[PDB]
Structure formats: C-alpha cells, structure tokens
Amino acid sequence: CSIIKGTGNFDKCVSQVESILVAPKLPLPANIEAASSGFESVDQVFRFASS
Amino acid sequence: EDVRKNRLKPLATYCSVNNPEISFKVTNEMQCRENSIDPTKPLAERMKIEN
Numbered sequence: 251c252s253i254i255k256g257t258g259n260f261d262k263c264v265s266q267v268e269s270i271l272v273a274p275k276l277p278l279p280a281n282i283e284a285a286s287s288g289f290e291s292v293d294q295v296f297r298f299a300s301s
Numbered sequence: 302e303d304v305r306k307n308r309l310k311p312l313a314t315y316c317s318v319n320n321p322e323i324s325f326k327v328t329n330e331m332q333c334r335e336n337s338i339d340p341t342k343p344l345a346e347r348m349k350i351e352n
Contacts (some may be wrong), residue, residue: 256342275327276327276328277327288328290327294325294326298325
C-alpha cells in the first residue's frame with residue numbers, strides 16, 4: 251500500500267465499520283477484570299443483554 | 302446405535318446451533334467443528350464416524 255484516498259461512500263463506510271469494528275468475525279479477547287462483565291463485542295451485548 | 306446411547310450425545314448437544322452457548326462467542330462453533338462435532342450438521346450426521 252502506497253496511498254489512501256477518500257471515496258466518501260457512507261454506506262460502504264458503515265458496512266466496513268460493522269465488519270471491522272462493531273461485529274468482527276474474530277473479536278479480540280474478552281476483558282475479565284472485576285469492573286468488566288466479560289463481553290467481547292457490541293454485537294454480543296445487545297443480542298443477549300438488551301435493556 | 303440409539304442416539305440416546307451415543308457417548309457423543311452430551312458433546313453433540315453442547316455443539317449445536319440450538320445452544321445459545323455457541324452463539325455468544327464466535328469461535329465456539331469453530332472449536333466444535335474442528336473437534337469433529339459440527340454444529341451445522343443434523344444430530345445423527347454430527348455424531349457419525351464416516352467411511
């Protein structure tokens with residue numbers, strides 16, 4: 251990769267945020283400290299603990 | 302040959318699409334499948350030793 255140039259396609263921006271950040275295929279390890287519930291993604295939170 | 306008398310039945314029940322346990326964590330379905338207990342396969346096919 252040499253250069254990054256903007257395309258400004260908000261819908262594709264959403265779909266990528268969705269797959270990279272919000273609901274990744276392989277999320278990083280869940281945090282199990284006292285202050286943490288132990289969830290690994292936003293996707294998992296609202297799918298099992300919605301309020 | 303009874304499904305009820307198969308030694309794999311409790312592992313097959315854990316490693317199933319029905320079980321929310323394998324739905325919470327993404328890697329769970331893969332950890333099942335790679336140990337020859339495929340949640341995608343129906344119960345009898347899931348416990349069967351091929352060839």
